[PDB]
Amino acid sequence: MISSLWIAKTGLDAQQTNMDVIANNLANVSTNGFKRQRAVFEDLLYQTIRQPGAQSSEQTTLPSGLQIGTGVRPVATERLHSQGNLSQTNNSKDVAIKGQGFFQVMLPDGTSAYTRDGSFQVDQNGQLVTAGGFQVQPAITIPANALSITIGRDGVVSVTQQGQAAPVQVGQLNLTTFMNDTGLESIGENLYIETQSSGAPNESTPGLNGAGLLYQGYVETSNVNVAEELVNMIQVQRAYEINSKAVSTTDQMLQKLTQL
Amino acid sequence: MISSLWIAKTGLDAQQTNMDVIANNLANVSTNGFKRQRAVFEDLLYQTIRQPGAQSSEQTTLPSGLQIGTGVRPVATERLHSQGNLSQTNNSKDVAIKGQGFFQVMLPDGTSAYTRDGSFQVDQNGQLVTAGGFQVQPAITIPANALSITIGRDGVVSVTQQGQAAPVQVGQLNLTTFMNDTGLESIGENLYIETQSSGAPNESTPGLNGAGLLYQGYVETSNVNVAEELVNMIQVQRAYEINSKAVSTTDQMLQKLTQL
Amino acid sequence: MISSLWIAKTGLDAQQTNMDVIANNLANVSTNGFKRQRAVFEDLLYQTIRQPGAQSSEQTTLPSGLQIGTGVRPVATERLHSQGNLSQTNNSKDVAIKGQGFFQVMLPDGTSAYTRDGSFQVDQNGQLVTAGGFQVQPAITIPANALSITIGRDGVVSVTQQGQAAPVQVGQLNLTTFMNDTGLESIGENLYIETQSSGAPNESTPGLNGAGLLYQGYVETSNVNVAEELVNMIQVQRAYEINSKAVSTTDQMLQKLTQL
């Protein structure tokens, strides 16, 4: 009913969105292959009223006329695709990425999703799957009597059987790189899918033209910096305070008009 | 919202960067051929509310006006390329450098990387490789029937075979020197790749125009000084706590302003 | 809308500016060659009302009439140009000034700034530059196959070549001194530009006319005294709280005036 109240409401909603993003970032600290998110805001419409640059008088113009702005709105939340610090879990099936590539998995629907988390297991049939049971492609089949699984820097998966001095190659782990890495649609479950803003999936060998190197026994932890989150929590709390105070001040003004 | 808050926020990030540098230096104490890092900081923006030297009057000039400054920013993290202490492992395959040279190794991609690590091993094919399996170039191969590998102070590699009353030469080991060793980009595995700030790699014999000498049976330990790391730990902890206290002071001032 | 509220606004602004000065000093504790700032405040206007000195009763003057004053405005921030503590880093490229001199650096746009930070680097062409890539004046050039760089206490630079037992002088490092060191305009990046309140640049070699002496392997740390900063926090907080209390009291007075 009054403009300042709508503007302050938009400010409150934006600050709540910022706090939601902060809480989501802090809730996924222990998640492997997680990237922290940051929201970016834009100011809302600007009421024209007096067009600046108009002729103030026959020989003079109006410098920077009367523009009344509306509130604020969030544009987008961008991920920070940076290499998190590696953690040694001493497991032959945990794989970490040193560069800028992704693992490809197949959803039950038949479509292909992409995940950076490398905590892998083996199913009852022998294929390498993720923690959610999704099959890593290209299919890597581990045979029944395996003694040790070796995954090299270039993505070759080898199995050393009993009594044979040579290792048997059973697959080849490739990495998919996208032109726009932040444009992927996150569906949860540490899974990102291709959108039209994320270019096209370019398959490549882990060590070639820009795919990262695969480390066995390592996991890529989240890149969330927690002290920054605490400081940003302080900032968000204070901003929400100030916006609520603006709402309360507008409430007090309308009261006097009602009393009139 | 408050400039003091932003300035403290930066200061906190700068001190966290210092802490991370110290932690990384301490984590690599026992690694051979390591160069400890050091961060350099610089002044951020300077708000010129009142210009220093402004002509306040036709006769008097304002000295040292209102130059309100912003926080701090780390210029870079430069590695200290100094000769670490030599240690005798007493192995024929261990080499150490005395001056400022680099060994050249070949990545699977075909490009050349540079290392100061001297722990060499022969592979199944007999070529000398580093601990990460990267082949030294220009390739030094060693035959199967070699009784002892002798690497001279000038880089001449020889072996004594059964019978052969004379030791045969199987190649020559050279060192690459750079104009600016600090600008080399570290990729891990004790490997540095050249950039445009590191000039060009100059190949030279170990004892010639300024490449260092080669000592056999010696290994170059890291140059990290533990006592300096602990003292810097204390100083960085105190500075970080004080910056956090500044953040708290700004928070309390904002709370008092809001409680109006 | 009421005088006391404007005066309290000015007081709040002054205390906030003091807080920015404190935060800027704190954020640059680890910055090499940093000088701490201090702000100076002055009284604002004084409304005349009854003129002090005007003759009442024909033969009796009026002493100390109604000089109702307005708030406070900060005059300027002045840097404390004192010698910071020297820290030994054992580097051939770190130079520390012990007296009252400045290094001259050329910005690529053509003009020259002045810096006290002595952490110098070598570009791919062999020139001595600042850590931000700015080429120090004069363009001391270092030969390719340098074994040791010696910067003497008189600013002379010597390089020890192989096969030459006598060092060869490759330059001369000078110090720039000013009439007024507080009048330099800080542009960030540890750089000062000359203003008309700082006189003109006086070149002098280190040891004569007053320029300081150059130490090799040492860095001039910041002169920020931190316990003083904490005590200044306590004041900058109470004073701000008290000014906010004055704002609140004026608000209550206006509220009762309105309500009647």
Swiss-Prot record, chains A, B, C:
Tree of life domain: Bacteria
One Gene Ontology cellular component annotation held by this UniProt entry: bacterial-type flagellum basal body, distal rod
Coiled coil (UniProt feature): none
One of the Pfam families matching this protein, by short name: Flg_bb_rod
InterPro entries noted in UniProt: Flag_bb_rod_N, Flagellar_basal_body_rod_CS, Flagellar_FlgE/F/G, Flg_bb/hook_C_dom, FlgE/F/G-like, FlgG_G_neg, LlgE_F_G-like_D1
GO BP annotations, alphabetical order: bacterial-type flagellum-dependent swarming motility
Record's subunit section: The basal body constitutes a major portion of the flagellar organelle and consists of four rings (L,P,S, and M) mounted on a central rod. The rod consists of about 26 subunits of FlgG in the distal portion, and FlgB, FlgC and FlgF are thought to build up the proximal portion of the rod with about 6 subunits each.
Homology family: Belongs to the flagella basal body rod proteins family.
Protein name as it appears in the record: Flagellar basal-body rod protein FlgG
